[PDB]
């Protein structure tokens, strides 16, 4: 099962092991039980070069896990800006909605990642996107105490 | 708010026989919230070298902490733990009793 | 190892 | 015996000071093996065991990332919880969380669990099914709905059933000499004439591991959980624990009372008498 090894490597960050496994033919889009992808693992870990080697390997940029989170979601929450940028350049869906209705913009706002907020806005993220609760990113910013992000979003509306 | 007052215990890591190095423990359990102030005394005054474990909570959502120091017992020393917590209006002092 | 995907409350 | 990987997380809003304190502690059974403190300089998970230090840097990096994800998540939880409860900022509140997987003597997945507490009260718990949630209140009911929609239980299942067990087994292979031990309690009697008429016999147990121990009194066939005080099991800081129990007994008793002991360290119990 090459997919387990590739998943582990993306979790561990063996960039060379990642490349060799992709060469062997591992499914770039291999799915875990919870539907997390190597892309999600790479976003989480901040393994920029692994991210790029997966994307060049034709990784499904918009693959949704069982929670409905995309790699963009993971990157936004965890603050891996260069990954955010590489994903977006790869064609990630700025407005992708998880099973909760959170956008990556939501997560960036609520976790207070202003730089990522700005990159997402430059990438066409919907400031007005409402989650299942009806809460805008501005609300989640306020609730998290990221007042500057809150005012950036309210001004960018 | 729930307010819960610590169980305080003072003891030695090993039985206190003189001529032999050991450690003084003040053990605190069952307090909530975590904002205790606790200091170990000798002969009525604060020992500064006090050091403690990582903050952990019990099944009932109550914090417990160990404070311990190096010491050696004598027949003329007096040791006490002194603890203060929001539940305690005046800080409770419990002398070390070698039993 | 900690849980890798904790969700917010 | 049964073994547990236990992770304890606590967060406390510190208004005006501006950042919540966040403590994380992991245990394997009764042995603290990892830690985190927001206020420590390291900003890294730190080894508390000689076995865990064999774990290399890739893991400590990954655990740093995961514990900081716990930190941010518990932060936003604090804020969302104080939203649900509609309480003003001007006061400290606490969040704490605890999860882990338990294995039997075969080291198979025995049981997993996850729990959540707000303000010291039980807020949400994973039922043993690992599939449904016991909500405490309408706020926890809200979070129940959200977690159901998000399928949080499938995540928790996959972790607690999967990697948790793998890691726990590895640690027990590495703690082969420190978590597999049992230390049998050493015990002694003491006698004090607490009054001109009354006395106490006190039975001590100390220097035992694990913490689980039982001590009880009998008048040779009658229950003596009456004139008796008992203290919680307490840590020596040697990585071992202590406890004692006493009986308030008449002076000059004809060795009628006895201290009975049971601990997993004793293959033959060691009941002993005045």
Residue numbers in the entry:
A (entry chain D): 13 to 169
B (entry chain B): 0 to 98
C (entry chain C): 1 to 9
D (entry chain A): 1 to 274
Show sentences the authors wrote.
We established a process to generate bispecific designed ankyrin repeat proteins (DARPins) that simultaneously target HLA-I/peptide complexes and CD3e. DARPins, which are based on an ankyrin repeat scaffold, create an elongated solenoid fold that creates a rigid, concave interface for target binding. In this study, we developed and characterized bispecific T cell engagers by combining two highly specific DARPin molecules to target the tumor-associated HLA-A∗0201/NY-ESO1157-165 complex and CD3ε. We demonstrated that DARPins can serve as a novel scaffold for TCEs that combine high specificity, potent T cell activation, and minimal off-target activity.
To elucidate the molecular basis for NY_1’s affinity and specificity toward HLA-A∗0201/NY-ESO1157-165(9V), we determined the three-dimensional structure of this ternary complex using single-particle cryo-electron microscopy at around 3 Å resolution. While the DARPin/HLA-peptide interface is well defined, the HLA-A∗0201 α3-domain and the solvent-exposed residues of the NY_1 helices appear less resolved. The N- and C-cap elements are positioned above the peptide’s N- and C-termini, respectively, while the IRs of NY_1 engage the central peptide region (p4M to p8Q). Notably, the spacing between the two HLA α−helices closely accommodates the entire width of NY_1. The centrally positioned peptide residues p4M and p5W are surrounded by the hydrophobic NY_1 IR1-residues I46, V48, L53, F56, and the aliphatic portion of the N-cap residue R23.
